[PDB]
Amino acid sequence: QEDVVVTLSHQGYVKYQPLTDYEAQEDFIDRLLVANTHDTILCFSSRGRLYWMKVYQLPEASRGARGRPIVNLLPLEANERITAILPVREYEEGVNVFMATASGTVKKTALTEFSRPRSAGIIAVNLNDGDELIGVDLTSGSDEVMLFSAAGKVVRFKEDAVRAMGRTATGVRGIKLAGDDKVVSLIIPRGEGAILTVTQNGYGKRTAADEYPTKSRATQGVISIKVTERNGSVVGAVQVDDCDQIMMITDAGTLVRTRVSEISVVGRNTQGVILIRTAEDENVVGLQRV
Q1: Which residues pair with 272 in a beta bridge?
Q2: Which residues form the domain of 12?
Q3: Which family does the similarity line name (predicted)?
Q4: CA 220-101-190 angle, 5° bins
Q5: CA 143 to chain centre
Q6: 252: three-class secondary structure by DSSP
């Protein structure tokens, strides 16, 4: 079973809705989740903290309705955004939480290490100044990990390469980042869906997942897309199936939805095609799979 849909918007309004009613009848859905009313959600923030919430503590609101600001439900600091929401019925055994920071560190902790909530939240990974927790997902012990950087680099390695650490551990380096570069996306590749990447000035592309070679961790990585001044930096990458849609938002509030099947499937050593035509000082700031 899975009863309701949890949504967290780009502006930080959170709500839930029974999914039957969610199926029937600016701001975009930044995280979507499916769970029971009495499931727990682990809310991981950009500051590297973790909060526990019962789904029923969220507002039940219709799909037109706005929801409640999550800053009013969690003890969030200034500019502390929710970067992951993970649903847990039972802290399933043999399942890992994998985390990735902008500075290229990664961390793997068993799900069960989070079975004891603290209402003030905990530190899920200690961060330095300016470093951010940019990705969290669940792995099974036998998954691969892909880290995507702003400069068009990607590293792909088996999750075995990261020793399962304790809840307090500081984490190891997942990718070697040159100079200004930062990790922007984490992907646990599953299935045959292609990798879609988009840049700041609206270029992007699909590349078959099997064309991303499995390297070792803590290397410099290979190229995922050629980043130029025309291109702009990589904003994000997601795995999509051919019937999926993506949504992109610029810092000018322009929202574009696009069916993935219309985006060309090319190699890693390209600049991409235009997915959204940005103005001169407009930059893509958000990518999300629908």
Answers
A1: none
A2: 1-290
A3: Belongs to the type II topoisomerase GyrA/ParC subunit family.
A4: 75
A5: 16
A6: coil
**In contact, 85 and 43? CB cutoff 8 Å:** yes
User: In whole angstroms, what is the distance from residue 157 CA to residue 147 CA?
Assistant: 9
CA distance 100 to 172: 10
Given a contact cutoff of 8 angstroms between Cβ atoms, the answer to whether 270 and 205 are in contact is yes
Number of domains in the chain: 1
Measure the N-to-C terminal CA separation of the chain; round to a whole number of Å: 21
Experimental method: X-ray
Tokens standing for 197? 């990447």
- Strands of 77-193 (E only): list them: 82-88, 96-101, 105-110, 122-123, 133-139, 144-149, 153-158, 172-173, 183-187
Q: Which residues contact 131 (CB under 8 A, 6 or more apart)?
A: 48, 101, 102, 103, 105
